[PDB]
């Protein structure tokens, strides 16, 4: 029996005052407390709306309440009862006539499945449906339901809140857990759909909860085991009902896992004490969500002063008293044989029954208020100049009503405002609940913060607050970001194996490692190929000390030969020998010493522009004096110092044009370091550098001295045959042979020495030492006669 309330404009209503237990009858005799505390709230909303001059003063608001106990056909019949009165043809049925009233909207669609079947027929006609307890989010689309407007946030808003609360609580990967055959399946579907597009959110595992058999608990023991298999995964979200939540918490308690993964609950969990009993370990960290549960004091005041004499508008309240503590009614029905006590005489038993106003009770008042405000907007925009209700409502459509319902931003029964989005869904106003036992001993769900559009919570709400909100934030392994890594992702999502790249490549923005140009290598941090000044060959103690001393020892010999050269012109010993020969030998020795000392300085662009010819000029100057001496002793031995100087200048000019030619080949530059070793902590390795000097160039430069030495030896072979002039020719021949032997040993040091990376600091030093030894031997052999003459 439906509820008829007189009024110019009436609203529909679908409220489940019965149950769908027995499948034979359409609705069971038993009633539900949640389904009976909502239609009375709608009646109160209506009789308070048509009572004040600020809301529909000129028109009264009627009601049309029908029962729908979540049936596929009976609820469908009651929903079709609304549009039957709109047409009201009834031309075929004749009995031997009534005044029908159209409905502007419905405040029904309580059950999740009833909403779809009601809106499907309500979409065809121009009558919207304002649901209040719908949970299934698949009806949030406008292409399939354009005449639907939810006053409660769908499960998609819950999934968005979960995403926002996981992104803002450290960890990024979470193992989801939901149960099929209920709102949990759609909830986890929306969660995955919104996490795939979300950036920075990861899914660790997805497991289903079977609701076929739960008493054996053989599945829950296996679920908690495979959840612990994955490493460092401590975040789990639950979208199932409380029934299996109790069992899974009991299983986690009896198992006593070493992982101690924190739980994340849904609106089903909320802030109830039923699932957990004396469970402190499993409850720690159980951060759970729950929408705003407001209380309307007006509804409580109206629901206490109820009697069987004044509440005659509804027909189900007469038989509603049968759901009390074993009491019935005898005015209309027959008393049961089990109990004969009557509870009609007093209503204090209802107060003693400890009833509580459900959270969904205030969700039917704001819907009626929103439709009343839409009708008020209609009246103000269409017929604001009429005494009562205007005739422009019967000939109107549902499109304008939907448009007026969409832009509704008024404050509902409680202090929170109610509004509708473009898809007819109210914004999610959720409250974050976390269980804590350290700060307080009694069981509590102390609120963290509110979730309306952003995150306004307390990060330091927990007593510890040190790192417990960061322990499940991982990259599928230990956090690896010390400055040398390589993020390579293959197969596994949002994770990469902690492995470094090669030592010859440095990372760039922690993404990839690439190779820098030559003479550069990554540092100890593998972040960039830094630049460092090259090494120098000046003041080397371990090895260069001996050649440095050998080169410095020649200064005294050069100073003694220079002073003795232009001096003692009276004695005939120096007059018999060529005066220019001694000067040429001294100049050659000085040039050789300068060339040996030039290797200490670091070569540059301008240094080897003049140092590339100083080494070659020194070797050729020394051999000129010996050639002049052999020419003189050959001219004197038969059966010219002027021509000797010209020959020496021509030999030097042949070397000058030559070095100019081999220098005009390439501009004077610096060569890069040559090495093939690994990279160590001192990034500034032994970067020895020089100008364009190689083995072929050195061989071409020393080739001219080889022929001169060969000619000197060939001349000395015959000069030593005839001994004369105090065996001076024999001494010259011995000196030439010693010089040739020293030059022969130098060629073997520079040949085949390819098994040493320090050749630039060994072979050049050995060659300089050999040249200095030859020059010193020549100077000692030449200055011996002058010393003997000075002594005697």
């Amino acid at each position: 029996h439906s509820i008829r309330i007189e009024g110019d404009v009436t609203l529909g209503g679908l409220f489940p005052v019965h149950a769908k237990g027995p499948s034979g009858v359409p609705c069971g005799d038993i009633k539900r407390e949640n389904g009976i505390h909502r239609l009375e709230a709608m009646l109160y909303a209506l009789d308070q709306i048509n009572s004040d001059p600020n809301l529909l003063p000129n028109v009264t608001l009627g009601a049309r309440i029908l029962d729908t106990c979540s049936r596929d056909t009976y609820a469908l019949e009651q929903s079709l009862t609304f549009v039957q009165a709109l047409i009201q043809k009834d031309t075929s049925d004749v009995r031997c006539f009534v005044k029908p009233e159209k409905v502007v909207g419905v405040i029904g669609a309580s059950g999740s499945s009833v909403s779809i079947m009601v809106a499907n027929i309500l979409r065809l006609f121009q009558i919207p449906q304002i649901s209040y307890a719908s949970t299934a989010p698949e009806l949030s689309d406008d292409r399939r339901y354009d005449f639907f407007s939810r006053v409660v946030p769908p499960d998609s808003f819950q999934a968005q809140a979960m995403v926002d609360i996981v992104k803002a609580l450290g960890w990024n990967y979470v193992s989801t857990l939901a149960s099929e055959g209920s709102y949990g399946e759609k909830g986890v579907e929306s969660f995955t759909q919104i996490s795939k597009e979300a950036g920075g959110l990861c899914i660790a595992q997805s497991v289903r909860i079977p609701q076929e058999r739960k008493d054996r608990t053989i599945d829950f023991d296996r679920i908690i085991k495979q959840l612990l298999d994955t490493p460092n995964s401590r975040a789990v979200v639950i979208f199932a009902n409380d029934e299996d939540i109790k069992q899974i918490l009991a299983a986690a308690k009896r198992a006593d896992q070493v992982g101690h993964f924190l739980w994340v609950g849904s609106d089903s969990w909320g802030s109830k004490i039923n699932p957990l009993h004396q469970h402190e370990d499993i409850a720690e960290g159980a951060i759970t969500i729950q929408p705003k549960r407001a209380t309307v004091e007006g509804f409580d005041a109206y629901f206490t002063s109820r009697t069987l004499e004044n509440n005659r508008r509804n027909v189900w309240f007469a038989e509603y008293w049968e759901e009390n503590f074993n009491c019935k009614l005898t005015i209309s029905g027959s008393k049961k044989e089990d109990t004969d006590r009557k509870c009609t005489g007093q209503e204090r038993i209802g107060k003693d029954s400890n009833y509580e106003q459900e959270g969904k009770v205030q969700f039917v008042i704001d819907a009626v208020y929103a439709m009343a405000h839409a009708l008020h907007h209609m009246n103000k925009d269409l017929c604001a100049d009429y005494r009562g209700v205007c005739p422009e409502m019967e000939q109107a459509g549902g499109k304008k009503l939907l448009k007026y319902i969409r832009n509704v931003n008024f404050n509902g029964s409680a202090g929170t405002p109610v509004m509708f989005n473009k898809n007819g869904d109210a914004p999610g106003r959720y409250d974050i609940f976390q269980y804590q036992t350290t700060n307080t001993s009694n069981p509590g769900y102390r609120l963290i913060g509110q979730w309306t559009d952003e995150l306004q919570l307390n990060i330091e709400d927990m007593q510890w607050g040190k790192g417990v909100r960061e322990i499940p934030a991982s990259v599928c392994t230990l956090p690896c970001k010390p400055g040398q890594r390589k993020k390579t992702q293959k197969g596994t999502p949002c994770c990469w194996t902690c492995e470094p790249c090669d030592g010859y490549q440095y990372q760039f923005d922690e993404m990839t490692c690439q190779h820098c140009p030559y003479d550069q290598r990554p540092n100890e941090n593998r972040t960039g190929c830094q630049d460092i000044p090259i090494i120098k060959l000046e003041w080397h103690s371990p090895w260069a000390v001996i050649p440095v001393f050998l080169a410095m020892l020649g200064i005294i010999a050069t100073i003694f030969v220079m002073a003795t050269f232009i001096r003692y012109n009276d004695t005939p010993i120096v007059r018999a020998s060529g005066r220019e020969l001694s000067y040429v030998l001294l100049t050659g020795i000085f040039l050789c010493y300068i060339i040996t000392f030039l290797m200490i300085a670091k070569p540059d662009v301008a240094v080897c522009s003049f140092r590339r010819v100083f080494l070659g000029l020194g070797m050729c100057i020394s051999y000129a004096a010996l050639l002049t001496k052999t020419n003189r002793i050959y001219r004197i031995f038969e059966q010219s110092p002027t021509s000797q100087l010209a020959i020496t200048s021509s030999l030097i000019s042949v070397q000058l044009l030559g070095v100019f030619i081999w220098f005009i080949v390439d501009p004077p530059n610096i060569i890069i370091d040559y090495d093939e070793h690994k990279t160590m902590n001192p990034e500034q390795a032994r970067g020895v550098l020089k100008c364009d000097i190689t083995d072929l160039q050195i061989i071409c430069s020393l080739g001219y001295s080889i022929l001169l030495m060969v000619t000197c030896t060939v001349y000395a072979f015959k000069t030593r045959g005839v001994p004369e002039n105090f065996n001076e020719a024999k001494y010259i021949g011995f000196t030439m042979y010693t010089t040739c032997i020293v030059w022969l040993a130098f060629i073997p040091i520079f040949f085949g020495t390819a098994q040493s990376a320090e050749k630039l600091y060994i072979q050049t030093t050995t060659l300089t030492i050999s040249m200095n030894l030859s020059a010193s031997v020549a100077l000692g052999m030449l200055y011996m006669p002058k010393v003997y003459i000075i002594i005697f």
Partner: protein
């Protein structure tokens, strides 16, 4: 206001739009003669034949509860609400009269000619546990079973024609076809299905546009210009309806350019509306639903009279309208229906197929539920409405009735609630002598079967069929491109001419000279030959070697004959013979240097070129040394030359045992012979030691030449010195020639051979001249 009902055991229902949308004031306008009455009488005759069929439904007789929707939305809802009101449990709401008929359950709701009415009826009936099959519903909107569960259309929707379009396009080998659609919802879903099927068949699409109906001819001109302004094919796709296709063909005719195109069901035949543009549509193939005429239905409709058939008020109004009169004047009896010809549409077949499909499903479910009884059993009194649709309506195998014997339809319902479609391909045949008219070529029952001989352009006699390939296939040449974006059709781009086809996208090189006859396999350097140098170029070196050998033999013969001369007696006769033998060995080395190149060949040529040079150099050095020593024993002079050449022999032997030559050919240019030129030994320290030894020998010879006071054989000594200087100059010239030709292939070897031959000839003629002056002159 009017409802047609027929008494029956299992009464069905019908929603045929008899009127059209009039306007806001009136409910609906006058009835239509084609889509509202003829289909109604068609389903009535089909139901009467069902009731009189002994093999189909013998025990149970089905009725009809048919309603009219007036081709509106709210009217369609209000009329379709009766089918459910008859099935409501409560039926009538409790009320008190201010002062009859009982609802009859309806199983079938066969009806719906438009898209919106069918959508609304399916949305209302999906949830009330009642099946509903349609006869004219070609929109792809009623395809998602989540929104329309109970719906099984007997007509194939327009988006099924995408498969036939793809079959046609693949039959004629067309790739770069273009397409055009409408901005309507049906047009966009049809073109989306077309793109889906083309991507499934890997068919490219040039352009995709949506033309409207409320635009002037300027927009059509612009869109056809944008279509034909990118020429890469000659075939297009016309998916729009006839009202737009007529103006599109008119615009194309205004362009004076015509081509071939395919047409959807909108332009199946439509010969009367587009008869203005006959030139543009000269070559085109269309798609039209198969509609065989029904002789029984035609004879039934032609013999219909309101006096004999008064159970249909809509038929009475249609008779009043088609034969305009007034029943008050009683002038309608004079008019006869046989005077005007009867035109049958293509939807009568659909309505009879739908009602027969539902009757067959009812028969199958009645046989599977209660076959022992022929009338409705107690279990079948209430129709479930869901199992009948899921198991029996969808899974039906009945044959199409009232059809000619030579044709077979076999219409069925798939898993999506859609009827199997038979499309006849109509082509516009050019008839200059007569009149332009269409011609059927093939059908699309299951697979595309059409004859190319009947099609004018497809027949080989008229010419080759127009192609739609964006590019032309290329032979074994430059590879196909791998550029992204335009991956629908391929184009092969030019490579470097010295590369082969490594793959279908990679363009590498593995060998030139010989063209690989295979597709991809086969790679070799070159089938090289034994001899590479030409006979004309090598003739000069052979002639020079022969002249040098003949000159040496003549000098040796003159010295042997004139052995008693005082000049040769007091000289190195044995040394002269050794020098002659060495000069003769020089011609053998030069000839061997132009033989078949190989490892042993190159080593032998190098060894000979070194040994002959060292031998003659040692001989001349010993001669000058003796001349300088005596003037300022033969065994010692003969052994010192051997001891001197032993050093070079040991050096070359050490270099041979230290480095093993091979047959590794490295070619710098991209196209050159892989034949071995000289040897595998490149520039290394081998040539350095030989050059140093030659320079030392030349320096020793020049130093020994310093003597110039020779009183005996002064002319011979001067000639020997001039020969030594000339040989040194020739060696210095060959050194820069070898340095410049260090990259040459055969020019370097030719120059080296010419140089060594010239030096040998000069050294031979220098000594041959004094012998000629002594003996010949």
């Amino acid at each position: 206001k009017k409802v047609l009902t027929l008494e029956g055991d299992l009464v069905l229902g019908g929603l045929f739009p008899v009127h059209q949308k009039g306007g806001p004031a009136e409910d609906c306008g006058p009835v239509n003669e084609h889509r509202g009455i003829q289909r109604l009488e068609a389903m009535l005759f089909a139901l009467d034949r069902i009731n009189r069929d002994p093999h189909l439904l013998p025990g149970v007789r089905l009725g009809a509860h048919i309603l009219d929707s007036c081709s509106k939305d709210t009217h369609a809802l209000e009329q379709a609400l009766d089918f459910v009101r008859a099935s409501l449990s409560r039926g009538a709401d409790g009320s008190r009269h201010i002062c009859g008929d009982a609802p009859t359950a309806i199983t079938g709701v066969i009806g719906g000619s438009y898209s919106d009415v069918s959508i609304q009826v399916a949305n209302l009936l999906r949830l009330f546990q009642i099946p509903q099959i349609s006869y004219a519903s070609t929109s792809a909107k009623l395809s998602d079973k989540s929104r329309y569960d109970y719906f099984a259309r007997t007509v194939p929707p327009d988006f099924f024609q995408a498969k036939a379009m793809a079959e046609i396009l693949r039959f004629f080998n067309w790739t770069y076809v273009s397409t055009v659609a409408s901005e309507g919802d049906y047009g966009e879903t049809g073109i989306e299905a077309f793109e889906l099927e083309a991507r499934a068949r890997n068919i490219c699409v040039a352009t995709s546009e949506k033309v409207g109906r409320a635009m002037s001819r300027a927009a059509f001109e612009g869109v056809v210009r944008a279509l034909l302004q990118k020429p890469s094919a000659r075939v297009a796709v016309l998916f729009t309806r006839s009202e737009d296709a007529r103006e599109l063909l008119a615009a194309s005719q205004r362009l004076n350019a015509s081509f071939t195109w395919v047409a959807s069901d909108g332009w199946g035949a439509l010969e009367s509306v587009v008869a203005g543009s006959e030139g543009a549509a000269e070559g085109a193939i269309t798609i039209e639903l198969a509609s065989y005429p029904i002789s029984d239905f035609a004879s039934y409709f032609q013999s219909l009279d309101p006096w004999n058939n008064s159970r249909n008020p809509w038929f009475r109004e249609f008779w009043e309208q088609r034969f305009r009169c007034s029943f008050r004047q009683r002038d309608c009896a004079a008019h006869s229906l046989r005077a005007v010809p009867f035109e049958q549409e293509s939807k009568i077949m659909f309505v009879v197929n739908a009602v027969y499909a539902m009757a067959h499903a009812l028969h199958n479910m009645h046989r599977a539920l209660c076959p022992n009884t022929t009338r409705l059993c107690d279990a079948m009194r209430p129709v479930n409405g869901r199992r009948l649709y899921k198991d029996f309506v969808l899974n039906v195998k009945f044959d199409a009735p009232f059809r000619p014997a030579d044709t077979h339809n076999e219409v069925r319902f798939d898993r999506f609630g859609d009827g199997i479609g038979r499309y006849n391909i109509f082509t516009y045949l050019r008839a200059g002598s007569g009149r332009y008219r269409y011609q059927k070529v093939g059908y699309w029952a299951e697979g595309l079967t059409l004859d190319t001989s009947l099609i004018p352009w497809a027949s080989p006699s008229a010419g080759p069929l127009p192609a739609s390939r964006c590019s032309e296939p290329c032979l074994q040449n430059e590879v196909k491109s791998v550029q992204p974006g335009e991956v629908c059709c391929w184009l092969c781009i030019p490579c470097q001419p010295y590369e082969y086809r490594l793959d279908e996208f990679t363009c590498a090189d593995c060998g030139l000279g010989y063209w690989p006859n295979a597709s991809l396999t086969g790679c070799f350097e070159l089938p090289q030959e034994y001899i590479r140098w030409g006979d004309a170029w090598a003739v000069g070196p052979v002639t020079i070697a022969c002249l040098g050998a003949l000159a040496t033999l003549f000098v040796l013969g003159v010295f042997v004959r004139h052995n008693a001369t005082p000049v040769v007696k007091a000289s190195g006769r044995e040394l002269c013979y050794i020098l002659l033998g060495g000069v003769f060995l020089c011609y053998c080395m030069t000839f061997i240097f132009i033989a078949k190149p190989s490892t042993a060949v190159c080593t032998l040529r190098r060894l000979g070129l070194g040994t002959a040079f060292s031998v003659c150099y040692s001989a001349l050095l010993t001669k000058t040394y003796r001349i300088a020593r005596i003037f300022g024993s033969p065994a010692s002079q003969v052994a010192i030359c051997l001891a001197l050449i032993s050093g070079q022999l040991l050096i070359v032997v050490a270099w041979l045992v230290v480095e093993a030559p091979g047959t590794g050919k490295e070619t710098a240019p991209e196209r050159r012979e892989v034949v071995t030129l000289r040897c595998n030994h490149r520039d290394a320290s081998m040539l350095g030691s030989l050059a140093y030894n030659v320079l030392l020998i030349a320096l020793c010879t020049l130093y020994a030449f310093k003597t110039r006071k020779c009183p005996e054989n002064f002319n011979e000594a001067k000639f020997i010195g001039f020969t030594m200087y000339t040989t040194c100059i020739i060696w210095l010239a060959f050194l820069p020639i070898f340095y410049v030709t260090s990259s040459d292939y055969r020019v370097q070897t030719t120059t080296m051979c010419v140089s060594v031959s010239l030096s040998g000839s000069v050294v031979l003629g220098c000594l041959f001249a004094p012998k000629l002056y002594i003996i010949l002159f």
